[PDB]
Design an enzyme around this catalytic site. Structure first.
Site, PDB file in Angstrom:
ATOM      1  N   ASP A  10       0.874  -1.172   0.000  1.00 59.16           N
ATOM      2  CA  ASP A  10       0.000   0.000   0.000  1.00 59.16           C
ATOM      3  C   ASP A  10       0.908   1.218   0.000  1.00 59.16           C
ATOM      4  O   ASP A  10       1.805   1.322   0.845  1.00 59.16           O
ATOM      5  CB  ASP A  10      -0.942  -0.042   1.207  1.00 59.16           C
ATOM      6  N   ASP A 129     -14.453  -6.713  -3.507  1.00 58.16           N
ATOM      7  CA  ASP A 129     -14.567  -6.615  -2.054  1.00 58.16           C
ATOM      8  C   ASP A 129     -15.974  -7.067  -1.694  1.00 58.16           C
ATOM      9  O   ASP A 129     -16.962  -6.562  -2.259  1.00 58.16           O
ATOM     10  CB  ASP A 129     -14.368  -5.178  -1.593  1.00 58.16           C
TER      11      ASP A 129
END
Length: 249
Positions: A10, A129
Site C-alpha cells: 500500500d 470486495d
C-alpha cells in the site's frame, strides 16, 4: 495445481504506508527497494495499491511503475482508483503487467472488456470486495463504503463474461484481522469461475495460507504480516511445500 504467494504494498506519495521492519534496507519505507527484496526472497508477484492525492496521483503512479519495472522481473499489478481505459493503458505501457480495477468495473463493466481488448484478459485483475449482508455475500465499492446490492455470485460470473483474467477477492469480514482468510467465501466463489482467484484479507499465520489453498485459491495476498515480519516468506513456502501445496521453490 501451481499456487502463488503475493505481497501487497500500500503506497502513498511513493512511500510504503506504515513502513516495514526490514532493517537490512537502505530505506525501509521505499516500495521499490522493498519490492526488489521481496522478489529476492521468493515472493511470486507484487501488487501496488496507491492512495496518493488526486492532483499528483497520475504522475506519482506512473513514476512508481517505471521505477519498479526496471528493478524487478516478477509480475506486478498496480491499482487504486483506476477509473478509465486511458489511465490503465498509461500504467501498463509504462511497465505494469496488470492493472486492478474495482469501483470503476462495477460502475462500468465494459471497462473490463475495453482493457482486455488492447492488453489481453491476463492484464485485467478485477478486485472484488465482499461481505455478508443478511446471509448473502454482497459486493462493496468505494473502499468498502457502499453496498452495491449486487450479489457476489452474479458479479463473479459477469466479470469472467466481460473478459477479466483474475479475481482479487477480499473479504471485508476478515480484512485487517489476523484471524484467517475467509475460506467459506473462497469456496463459494470457486465453482462459479474458471479464473484464477487471489485470496485477500485476514492473513495472520502460515497455516492460514494452507487453508486458503485448500479452499481453491490460486494465489494468496498479504501485506503487514510480511512487512512487519510476522511471517517469513521463505519459511512460508517451505511450510506449504511440506504439506503438499505446489509452490515455487
Amino acid at each position: 495445481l501451481a499456487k502463488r504467494i503475493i505481497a501487497c504494498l500500500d503506497v502513498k506519495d511513493g512511500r510504503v504506508v506504515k513502513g516495514t521492519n526490514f532493517e537490512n534496507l537502505r530505506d525501509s519505507g521505499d516500495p521499490v527497494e522493498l519490492g526488489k527484496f521481496y522478489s529476492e526472497i521468493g515472493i511470486d508477484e507484487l501488487v501496488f495499491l496507491d492512495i496518493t492525492a488526486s492532483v499528483e496521483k497520475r504522475k506519482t503512479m506512473l513514476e512508481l511503475v517505471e521505477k519498479v519495472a526496471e528493478q524487478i522481473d516478477i509480475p506486478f499489478t498496480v491499482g487504486g482508483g483506476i477509473h478509465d481505459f486511458e489511465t490503465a493503458s498509461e500504467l501498463i505501457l509504462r511497465g505494469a503487467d496488470k492493472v486492478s480495477i474495482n469501483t470503476a468495473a462495477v460502475e462500468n463493466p465494459s471497462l473490463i472488456t475495453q482493457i482486455a481488448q488492447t492488453f489481453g484478459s491476463q492484464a485485467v485483475v478485477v478486485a472484488i470486495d465482499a461481505k455478508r449482508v443478511d446471509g448473502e455475500f454482497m459486493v462493496f465499492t468505494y473502499s468498502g463504503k457502499k453496498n452495491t446490492g449486487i450479489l457476489l455470485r452474479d458479479w463473479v460470473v459477469e466479470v469472467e463474461k466481460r473478459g477479466a483474467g483474475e479475481i482479487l477477492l477480499t473479504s471485508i469480514d476478515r480484512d485487517g484481522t489476523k484471524s484467517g482468510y475467509d475460506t467459506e467465501m473462497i469456496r463459494f466463489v470457486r465453482p462459479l469461475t474458471t479464473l484464477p482467484i487471489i485470496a485477500s484479507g485476514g492473513a495472520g499465520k502460515m497455516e492460514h495460507f494452507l487453508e486458503a489453498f485448500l479452499a481453491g485459491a490460486d494465489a494468496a495476498l498479504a501485506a503487514s504480516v510480511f512487512h512487519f515480519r510476522e511471517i517469513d516468506v521463505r519459511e512460508l513456502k517451505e511450510y506449504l511445500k511440506k504439506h503438499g501445496v505446489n509452490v515455487r521453490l
